[PDB]
Design a protein around this ligand. Structure first.
Ligand code: CDL
Ligand code: CDL
Ligand code: MQ9
Ligand code: 9YF
Ligand code: 9YF
Ligand code: HEM
Ligand code: HEM
Ligand code: HEM
Ligand code: HEM
Ligand code: 9XX
Ligand code: 9XX
Lengths: 153, 145, 534, 534
């Protein structure tokens, strides 16, 4: 793929510097501030649109409109509060072996609930394949991932 | 346009020049009411105020109901089943009152305060120019030949 | 503080003439020139509510045991997609509200385009030079339908799953390469892994991107032709009469914009859609009676119902009966896409039309449109003819036969009636120009002849009998209240009588105002005449 | 029948005039003006290879037993994300090729932007009126880094998982909103169910949308304000000298585009990147040596290593030692984004700049740039000093201290050396203009003086020493071969010459052409002198 695309690229570039003529083109720049004629024409049009709307005189209307628009904006973005969760609310159900879900608990906290927690050595056991009349399936029945350990081990 | 003669134009005359550089002519621009302190101004102002205040109430309602209302699931025969089944409808009612009322207020302002307008613009379409056509097929032809 | 922000923004983008041009564009004001906005606003709601909806959704088919907010369905084995969709309505604060907003917006979107397309079709806005717009728009509606289809198939509930089963079995039963194509899309037999993944990645990216690109191109191309408008006073084929972008058009667009947004926010709360908790996880054995896909997809399902058992057996190979359905739907799409070309072949008129035309003045096209609408509506009704049959106490076999026969005689009757009514509307329009507005003043002449007072809109010759005004392509008044002969001449509030002093001046001012308006409009007309004779 | 295709396209869109201007835009030809195109082409490859990559990827965390193609991982419990990433590379024909293309393209993308930013910085292309482009581009690089980060963390392998652990624990340690922010992003404790779904959607849609939008805005804004150029012969601040869009620029753009595409396509096959099969599924308890993020993320990780243990223990509260790292990284970004403004503040230059400047003529900025490059490189190296320590046999503690101390002493030495070298380069330029090119032909005068022949580039007086020319902002030749005095005067192949008649005739035309070319530049300058007079 490298050879194909790269070679085509080389062929195309080698054509422009051998066959396409030599050109120096000079273009005039039109940039910076615009002409004053148009400049005072765009500010006068915007000023006309604001003055004729007669909104500057209505303090109450524009005051309430600001409030209304802010409340609308906040109404739109409010369902983003569904993402907000309390870090200090324990997850539903009793405390499992992964703790309570908060930063306080570590699955070793089960020791404080009169549970007998061992020290589990990881045997890194994997699933067993079993082929039958009904295809092959992976079962994890007899296999124990964590095993108890002795103080001589 | 010399700057010297640009300062000799009104705030309006400059705009009328401006609108005409875009092939636009403003026919029939009329102020909504050229009456000194007529009650109709107050009436128009009191209609858009109604829909603004009502929108604010709707917004505050949506915020209040979103935060402080039982929103968790209640099953058939639970105590708070009524208060729960009404959470989503209340959200709809309040949000749809906030934004809708603001919309009504904005449209009522356009119809009652912003002046009447007829603008007529020239339209530029067809087979372009006689010069531009000839000089694009000549440039393209040149770059191929 | 404001004079200086503009100064150093113009000094570097030279944008004074560029912005002035945009804010001075004139747009025709007509209620039917806004129906396109509804589609746009609904599309904005979809992509915005959609992004929020993807923060809580896992598009996986991996089976799990549910334990969550929905206390029923606890312990039930479901997909990961179904469990998370069930979680965004019972475990996410205001998640049901957003889910319903999304679905309602989808419905409005499809109806926002269909009605828009009808406006474009009837008024003849697809004519030269606007055919790229027609093609772009047609692609937009088909892709919108496809997008909606793959959207409600994401939750992987029982109702949507049957739709996927139908769709997969439609593909698999295609001549020659329908077997390989089905296996290429789903990645194997249905259902498959990487089936809710390909659909989810094409519904939140592939289609949106394509749609957004087409929409942006559509709008830019519209802004280049600066719209079209109906024939009227002072308006020719080389001008636009309406309102400028600011301050009138932009504010009206926002006002209507938020109106649509607010309306969708109401339905999202007060009205239930797609109650997926009642449907259960997808199971290939379980089905329900009302298995209609969705309103925009009903026509395809209705086509499948009314197609007879016409299988073609070819020795070792078979053509399913549903193949003809595909063929038929393909023809309907091809007819719809390439309409401007077929309309101008049989009319022999391609003359760069910028002035619209009222539906009543094009009876053949109007009648074809109503003929096609009846076709589409009958397909749509047939698509949900099992809910029609029960709720309205009609034989289901009778409904099938109504669909079958009605697709031939329904369109025919629609054409006949519509054509005659168009000509009728044309005739009523000429009576007014020839004789004048029929006022309701039945006078008795001394001889005893009962005569109705007629109000001429033009000059009269000798003794009434107005000089017949030629048709002008515009709406002629039909009542005397349309000329403001019923206008209330009492300024004030509901209770306020209003001072006469301020009440006299205002009636005088409005009188002078509409006089000046009429004068300027007729001057514009005169300008066009002496311009068109050179 | 092509003129009739043009006729239809013109009669509709009045496009002859507006495209003549598009095909006539002139762009300066310089090798450094092609660096932005590399970023563009890499971005195009990322979008295309990314979409292909999502048809086979399931972004789920749900644990499964692997029974796929990679037999050395069969029977291990992994997530759906890792299992499907393993299926792209072991079960899809040419899936590993595309995966590697994607990752290589990501690397090239980020480095292309870096090198392009360096070009913009050194040459002074960020000056008025191009500050908006600088800010847009800076946002582009930060988002590019973020995009790459959430991309390599999708497979949910052991290496990437530690990156997420680091990132989550950085956020959780924030002074006030630190634990509340973590629960809002991940949807709970790390890891969480929704985490890889929020990461997937941010990676396939959210960021690329923003990126594409910013890129499109970037290109349009560049195309509008033509381009900057080096102050060469005949070149002013009110013109552009280069080549037109067609036929020369457009073809060159395609050729270079293919070159980049072909190069990425070679790397995708010939070198391994992110060999995820070697690493296993993510496990919070197991880790590897080094375990660095991607090259573009190394500076952030290097910041965390060289920051001492400076925890603040307030009353019952804690500010982690990581917080200061965030502060430092917050400063570096803010310094980078708002550079044009601090440039202008300390220099008092607020003019309209269209002519570039060589790095050697702005020693303070050049030196600051090299100072900042050394800072970035030291952060990058120290973020990955474990791999440096082991492979290059240096103490790891020594590496940490080198990073700590080097961030003070390295920048200082870099500034000093760079400044002096810039002035040195300035001096070498002036010697040529004052005295002429040093030929290198040392000859002995009759008296016995060894003198080197000097070639003056300007007119001489009448006492040897020629009147020195002033600096003109452009490169001045320093070798005699740069004036073509070593040019080969044989035309022909490798084995055989050309006929004499065809040879001498060819040298004549080339001589006449190069003379006339120089004449164009001379005439340009003359007109420009008179132009600048007014
Ligand atoms: C209030 C407004 C504030 C501005 C923000 C609004 C954002 C978009 C502006 C839309 C209105 C302009 C519409 C228009 O078409 O007028 C063009 C108008 C010039 O009109 P003109 O004088 O008739 O020029 C003749 C041709 O159009 C010249 O054509 P050309 O041949 O030279 O090619 C130019 C072509 C570009 O080339 C092409 O793509 C053509 C294709 C070539 C294919 C070969 O298109 C353009 O003209 C580029 C202008 C727009 C730049 C992109 C938008 C930037 C917004 C993103 C920044 C925000 C983040 O240009 C502008 O108005 C400049 C845009 C200003 C962007 C401001 C940058 C952000 C800074 C904000 C800081 C706030 C403090
Ligand atoms: C190369 C040949 C073309 C290849 C076609 C495919 C690629 C499209 C190329 C687009 C770039 C055109 C060159 C350009 O930028 O100059 C504008 C150029 C005219 O130059 P100009 O007279 O200086 O325009 C400036 C106006 O004075 C001032 O203009 P304005 O104030 O009226 O605003 C116009 C502005 C848009 O309005 C705004 O400025 C936004 C303001 C918003 C404020 C709120 O942009 C436009 O409307 C320009 C045309 C954009 C059309 C969009 C592309 C449609 C492609 C359809 C394929 C669908 C896939 O426009 C064209 O030539 C029309 C493009 C033709 C597109 C027809 C494609 C239909 C498909 C048939 C294919 C058959 C095979
Ligand atoms: C001549 C030429 C081709 C010039 C190049 C211009 C160009 C391509 C510029 C770059 C584009 C820009 C400015 C990008 C902004 C970059 C940025 C800050 C952020 C990235 C954007 C982003 C995150 C996108 C992803 C998702 C997202 C939020 C998308 C936008 C969604 C929306 C609002 C889509 C609809 C808007 C759209 C595509 C309009 C096309 C433009 C035209 C011609 C509109 C005409 C128009 C019509 C037709 C109306 O009906 C209307 C009704 C009511 C109000 C206004 C309008 C209106 O403006
Ligand atoms: C752009 C301008 C931004 C202005 C912000 C104004 C926007 C208004 C809407 C904000 C969203 C709604 C606000 C409150 C919403 C609310 O009521 O949430 C409770 C509230 O928090 C608390 O109590 C402590 C107070 C926290 C303050 C909350 C207000 C949010 C503001 C301060 C943050 C935004 C400002 C930052 C700028 C943003 C720019 C981006 C950088 C959480 O208690 P909790 O018990 O965890 O409830 C859980 C269920 O929510 C959940 O579904 C779950 O299912 C349940 O299990 C349950 O845990
Ligand atoms: C929609 C995609 C557009 C493709 C772009 C066109 C590129 C042309 C070159 C295509 C490369 C050919 C690849 C064919 C592959 C092949 O050899 O297929 C095997 C057996 O094929 C056969 O004998 C007959 C193959 C006939 C199909 C070839 C189709 C190409 C032409 C006819 C179609 C025109 C394309 C029109 C362009 C439209 C452009 C649209 C963008 C299936 O054995 P299987 O045991 O299932 O092993 C599996 C692996 O093969 C498999 O890759 C997979 O990755 C594995 O997982 C494994 O399952
Ligand atoms: C995605 C949905 C669509 C959106 C958002 C959309 C948007 C718009 C908008 C905003 C306009 C400006 C004028 C107006 O409001 O009437 C317009 C005009 C137009 N649209 Fe659409 N449109 C859509 C679908 C379609 C479809 C399906 C068709 C055709 C089959 C179509 C063909 C046209 C045509 C011909 C015009 C020109 C009307 C005129 O210039 O007089 N559009 N569209
Ligand atoms: C282009 C217009 C779109 C249409 C017509 C559309 C339509 C739909 C529909 C009908 C549903 C089913 C909703 C339900 O179950 O009640 C849906 C679901 C969904 N859509 Fe869209 N959609 C669109 C755009 C988007 C976009 C742009 C995104 C993401 C960026 C998105 C993300 C989703 C998600 C995550 C679901 C979740 C399924 C669920 O929660 O029910 N959609 N869409
Ligand atoms: C996403 C990666 C980027 C892409 C694809 C990109 C693309 C381009 C292209 C195509 C050009 C015009 C050609 C050129 O001069 O090389 C350009 C110019 C420019 N870019 Fe970038 N760019 C990128 C990143 C950046 C960054 C990171 C910055 C600044 C921090 C930047 C600032 C500029 C400036 C100032 C110019 C103007 C050069 C000139 O006009 O003289 N760009 N860019
Ligand atoms: C700024 C552009 C992008 C960058 C810098 C980027 C970067 C990356 C990186 C570094 C990876 C890790 C690759 C690996 O696992 O070997 C990745 C993976 C991925 N990217 Fe992208 N990406 C970009 C755009 C996209 C887009 C637009 C999409 C999809 C529409 C996408 C979809 C994916 C997917 C699905 C993966 C996971 C597949 C896999 O891990 O093998 N990427 N990306
Ligand atoms: C010339 C106009 C001809 C009008 C045709 C009327 C023919 C009906 C007779 C069918 C039949 O009784 O033979 C059964 C045969 C044993 O089975 C087949 O092979 C089926 C034949 C395929 C017919 C698919 C028709 C598709 C319909 C749509 C494409 C049209 C919608 C517009
Ligand atoms: C000014 C002078 C900076 C000198 C440092 C003074 C470090 C003395 C450490 C003494 C100590 O251990 O007291 C414990 C307390 C807990 O430590 C602190 O509070 C100091 C945290 C500050 C770290 C900011 C580092 C940010 C770097 C950026 C400034 C670089 C951007 C370029």
């Amino acid at each position: 793929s490298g050879l194909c695309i790269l070679s085509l690229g080389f062929a195309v570039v080698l054509y422009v510097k051998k066959f396409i003529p030599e050109e120096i083109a000079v273009q005039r720049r039109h940039d910076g501030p615009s002409e004053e004629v148009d400049r005072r024409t765009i500010v006068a049009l915007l000023n006309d649109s604001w003055q004729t709307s007669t909104l500057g005189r209505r303090k109450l209307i524009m005051g309430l409109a600001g409030g209304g628009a802010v409340l609308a904006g906040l109404t739109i973005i409010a369902p983003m509060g569904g993402m907000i969760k309390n870090p200090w609310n324990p997850k539903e159900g009793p405390m499992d072996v992964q703790g309570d879900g908060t930063l306080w608990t570590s699955g070793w906290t089960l020791v404080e609930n009169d549970v007998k927690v061992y020290l589990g050595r990881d045997t890194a056991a994997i699933a067993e394949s079993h082929t039958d009349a009904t295809g092959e399936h992976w079962s994890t029945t007899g296999v124990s991932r964590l095993v108890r350990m002795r103080p001589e081990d | 346009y010399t700057t010297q003669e640009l300062n000799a134009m009104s705030n309006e005359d400059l705009a009328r020049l401006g609108t005409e550089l875009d092939d636009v002519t403003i026919a029939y621009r009329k102020e909504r009411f050229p009456i000194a302190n007529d009650p109709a101004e107050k009436r128009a102002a009191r209609a858009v105020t109604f829909w603004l205040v009502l929108g604010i109430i709707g917004g505050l309602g949506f915020l209040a109901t979103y935060i402080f209302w039982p929103w968790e699931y209640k099953a058939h025969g639970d105590e708070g089943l009524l208060a729960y089944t009404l959470y989503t409808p209340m959200l709809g009612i309040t949000s749809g009152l906030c934004i809708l009322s603001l919309g009504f207020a904005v449209v009522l302002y356009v119809k009652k305060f912003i002046p009447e307008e007829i603008a007529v613009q020239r339209r530029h379409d067809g087979p372009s120019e006689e010069v531009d056509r000839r000089t694009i097929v000549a440039l393209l032809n040149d770059s191929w030949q | 503080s404001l004079a200086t922000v503009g100064n150093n923004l113009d000094s570097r983008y030279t944008m004074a003439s560029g912005i002035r041009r945009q804010i001075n564009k004139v747009f025709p004001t007509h209620w039917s020139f806004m129906l396109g906005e509804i589609a746009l606003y609904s599309f904005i709601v979809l992509l915005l509510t959609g992004v929020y909806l993807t923060l809580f959704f896992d598009p996986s088919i991996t089976k799990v045991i549910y334990d969550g907010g929905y206390l029923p369905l606890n312990g039930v084995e479901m997909s990961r997609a179904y469990a998370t969709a069930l979680d965004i309505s019972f475990e996410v604060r205001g998640g049901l509200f957003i889910r319903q907003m999304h679905h309602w917006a989808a419905l409005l979107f499809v109806v926002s385009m269909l009605v828009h397309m009808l406006r474009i079709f009837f008024t003849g806005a697809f004519r030269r030079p606007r055919e790229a717009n027609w093609i772009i728009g047609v692609v937009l509606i088909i892709l919108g339908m496809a997008e909606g289809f793959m959207g409600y198939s994401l939750p992987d509930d029982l109702l949507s799953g049957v739709g996927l089963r139908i769709m997969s079995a439609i593909i698999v039963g295609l001549p020659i390469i329908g077997t390989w194509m089905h296996w290429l899309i789903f990645g194997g037999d249905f259902p498959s892994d990487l089936m809710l993944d390909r659909f989810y990645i094409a519904h939140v990216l592939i289609i949106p991107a394509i749609l957004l690109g087409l929409i942006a191109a559509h709008l830019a191309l519209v802004w280049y032709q600066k719209h079209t408008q109906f024939p009227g006073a002072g308006r020719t084929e080389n001008n636009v009469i309406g309102i400028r972008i600011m301050p009138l058009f932009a504010v009206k667009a926002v006002a209507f914009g938020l109106i649509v947004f607010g309306f969708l926010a109401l339905l999202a709360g007060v009205t239930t859609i797609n109650a997926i908790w009642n449907l259960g996880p997808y199971n290939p054995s379980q089905v329900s009676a009302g298995s209609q896909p969705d309103v925009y997809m009903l026509w395809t399902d209705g086509a499948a119902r009314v197609m007879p058992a016409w299988e073609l057996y070819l020795g070792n190979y078979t053509i399913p009966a549903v193949f003809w359905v595909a063929v038929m739907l393909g023809i309907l799409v091809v007819l719809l896409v390439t309409y401007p070309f077929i309309e101008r072949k049989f009319t022999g008129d391609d003359a760069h039309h910028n002035l619209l035309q009222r539906p009543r003045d094009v009876p053949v096209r109007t009648s074809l449109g109503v003929m096609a609408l009846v076709f589409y509506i009958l397909l749509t009704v047939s698509g949900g003819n099992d809910v029609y049959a029960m709720q309205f106490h009609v034989s289901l076999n009778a409904m099938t036969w109504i669909g079958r026969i009605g697709l031939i005689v329904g369109p025919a009757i629609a054409y006949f009636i519509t054509y005659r009514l168009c000509i009728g509307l044309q005739r009523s329009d000429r009576e007014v120009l020839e004789h004048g507005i029929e006022t309701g003043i039945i006078k008795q002449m001394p001889n005893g002849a009962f005569i109705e007072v007629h109000q001429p809109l033009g000059p009269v010759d000798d003794h009434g009998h107005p000089i017949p005004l030629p048709y002008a392509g515009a709406a002629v008044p039909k009542q005397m209240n349309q000329l403001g002969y019923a206008e209330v001449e009492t300024r004030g509030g509901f209770f306020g009588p209003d001072p006469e002093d301020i009440r006299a001046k205002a009636k005088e001012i409005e009188h002078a105002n509409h006089i000046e308006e009429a004068n300027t409009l007729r001057a514009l007309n005169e300008a066009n005449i002496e311009r068109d004779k050179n």
